[PDB]
Amino acid sequence: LVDRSGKHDLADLRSLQDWFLKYELKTIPDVAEVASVGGVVKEYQVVIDP
Amino acid sequence: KNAREVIAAVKDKLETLKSSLPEGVEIVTTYDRSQLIDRAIDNLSGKLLE
Amino acid sequence: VQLKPGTSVAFSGQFELLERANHKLKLMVPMTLMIIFVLLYLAFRRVGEA
Amino acid sequence: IIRRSVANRFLVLMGALFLSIWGTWTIINTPVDALPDLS
Known about the structure:
This is part of a larger assembly, with 4 copies of chain A. The first copy, chain A, is mainly alpha-helical. Chain A is 30% helix and 4% strand. Chain A is flat and about 55 Å long. The termini of chain A are far apart. In chain A, 0% of the residues are buried. The A-B interface holds A 1-5, 7-8, 13, 16, 21, 24-25, 28-31 and B 1-2, 6, 9-10, 13-14, 17, 21-28. Chain B: Part of a cation efflux system that mediates resistance to copper and silver. Chain B: The cus efflux system is composed of CusA, CusB, CusC and CusF. Chain B: This is Cation efflux system protein CusA. Chain B: Belongs to the resistance-nodulation-cell division (RND) (TC 2.A.6) family.
C-alpha cells in the first residue's frame, strides 16, 4: 500500500489494511489468512512522571 | 487447494476495491505466483504441440 | 452512488445457485441421450430405428 | 480381439467420438498449477 501524496501516515495505511482488507480478502473461499507487514500500530501511551 | 483461481479472485476483488480506497493510496503487487503457473503451462503446451 | 472509506457492497440470492445448477444440467442432458443412442444402435444395429 | 472389433466397427467409431468429446471437455475444464505439493 503506497501513498504518492505524503498525506496518509503509515499508521493510517496500516489501520486501513488491518480493518478493511484483512476482512475483504478473507471472504474468498479458500484463503487461509491475510497477514499484515510493516506499518505502525496506533497506541495510547500514558507516560507517568515519577 | 488450487492457487490460480484464488489469485484470480484476489485480483478481481482488489480491482473492484480500487474505487473504495482513499484518494492517493495505491496497491502495487509484489509477488504473484500466477505468472510462473501461466508461463509453465504455456511452455508445456507449446512443447506438446511442437 | 459513492462509497465511504471502509465500506463495501455485494450481491447474492437464490439467483446465484440456479445459474450453476441449470448449467450443470445442460451438460448431462446431451450425454444421457448419447449413452442412450449407442444402447439403441447396438439393439437394432441400424441408425434409422434408433 | 482385433478382428472381433473390425466386424462391429461403427460401435467403435461412435465410442471413439464420444471419448474424444469427453476428453476435450475434461481438458478445457481442468485445473492448472506449476509444481505439486512437496511440503
